[PDB]
Amino acid sequence: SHRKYEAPRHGHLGFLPRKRAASIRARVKAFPKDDRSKPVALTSFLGYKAGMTTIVRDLDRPGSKFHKREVVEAVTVVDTPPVVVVGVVGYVETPRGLRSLTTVWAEHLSDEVKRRFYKNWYKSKKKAFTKYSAKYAQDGAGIERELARIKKYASVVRVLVHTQIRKTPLAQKKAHLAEIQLNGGSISEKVDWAREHFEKTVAVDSVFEQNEMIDAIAVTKGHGFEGVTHRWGTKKLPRKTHRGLRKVACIGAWHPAHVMWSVARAGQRGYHSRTSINHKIYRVGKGDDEANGATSFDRTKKTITPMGGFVHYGEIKNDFIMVKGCIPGNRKRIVTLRKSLYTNTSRKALEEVSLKWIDTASKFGKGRFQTPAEKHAFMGTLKKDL
Template identity: 30%
Template sequence: MSKAHKPRSGSLQYWPRNRSKRAYAKVNSWPEASDPKPLGFAGYKVGMTHITFTDNRPNTMTKGEEVSMPVTVIECPPLKIASIIFYKKTDSGLKSSSAFLSPNIDKELSKKIKLPKKNSKKKLEDYDIKEYEDIRIQVYTQPKLTSIGKKKPELFELGIGGKMEDKFNWAKENISKEINILDIFTEGQHVDIHSITKGKGMVGPMKRMGISRTSHKSEKGVRTPANLGAWTGARQWRVAKAGQLGKQQRKELNKWLLKIDNKPEEINMKSGFKRYGLVKNQYALLKGSVGGSVKGLNIMTVPMRPNRRHPKEKPSINHISR
């Protein structure tokens, strides 16, 4: 009789599986890029729909045919720069050394952080970029422009591409301007999605780790692991147990950015999207689903490991379901 082989259930990559401290993701590393512009953008998850388009993927059996595909709608109101952060290299890695606050900050940002009453006398021209290792910008969202029903913005960092001098010049020129998604991404390219998944609470090991149900003759339950690990040994193997599922930061690589448009009437339903409302700003269509709940913030970044097999041209969209 042949022996049944089965891969190990559950992933050992994400541990500990604790709840995220905040409601939106944090990007810790940025890819290298030659163009002096931000390496990411953020938008609010609206919901899902489907489109029909002419398949332009070179290695599919439906190449040149009209096919249907599920897509996620992301509303992308403009971002604003809160500050420019200067990093120095230390023995513990890059550490923020100084920051220059933007002179034009919305009053809604005071709901998120405590703003200084007086601006610093130090000017941006006084900074010597030779003393620093990296420059990043701290941006905030404008949920007041959407229909999600809040004014408190989200605050997070974005990396900038190019050399140090190019980064500094870009930040200097755009510190009082709004950042649009079309300034960073183009239709047809791929992006990485950083999001906080939906919280499921306390669940058992079958749903959490994907283990199989044991025999009905098993003692002390059939939805539990059969073995809790060795009693002896210097190294204990990780065992599937009950615990927290969801509300954790996850990243999905190489999502296809199918469309970016500033005409929300093309996708809006008469009554709006379920549990979201009407889209009022620029929006993006991403292939498939993305993590997180409706109205949650998803951060899109330049791909860290781009897939060369994926097409870089935008597809010809024939119909958007609404």
């Protein structure tokens, strides 16, 4: 017949299929355009999502009814100890797309990455890379030939980095390895940079800075098998209805005589890949800085960790990125921060922030105190104690 009343579809066809992602490490499907005039640097970074908290800052938006007033804002924090560089991989342009032609590895590989190449570490003879490592013995010659080849050919150079998971409260020991496109100028300069950085270490301040707009690429929280109502935001059917009501009443017309790809159905929910963009960096933390969670306006020596510590995560004892708002994925997940694909002029992006205050109270209840110092002050002396 014809609908009756018009309404928009439930849910976005551009995020199909709604199946579980092929890996907890969401893929970077694109990198920034290359500007080979600038210095060589990474274009993304690995970290772990730890938690959120609240911020207060004064706003700067000439014209807003909130210009020059304080706002309070949710932000998230991602643990970010220096990534360590261990390979370069060199790609070439073909009429069938980008194809990698070599990979050169550092001579010494940390147990952390080595562990990544294995399914049962405890039993294994840990032989990974033990013949590659030899290639260095000899003067250096075949590793030069490779490095050399990459320079000769190669349209784009990526770096194999991995995270220092041990520098993180996680149990998980096996580190995360991944390719990061290099955008500083000249294919040769790029590989030189790469080669120079083997076994050597790279920190976030070398990649991100205050007020930058960055993207988060990560696998979404999982939910298992979801009915149609919650998964697609379909209307609940009425109370009166027999044989269940969190459903879709009509699964299709009679012709085409086939349930169609575009109707909502029960199925997996969450644990999807997502490339969320335009998240402002409101803080770039330093792990060797007491007074991490302190401010120009605050002053009190205290770190970003909440009282009792980040619920379900742990402590934060390294550099971190504090991103305004909230990000795909959950507490503990490997998450990739990426440079933005365009120069946003937004004004909203561009505004330069300065935190006045960072919340620091326990998130494990309705916290009343920032430091244990403050808590003793307000509360008095207790039956434990002095």
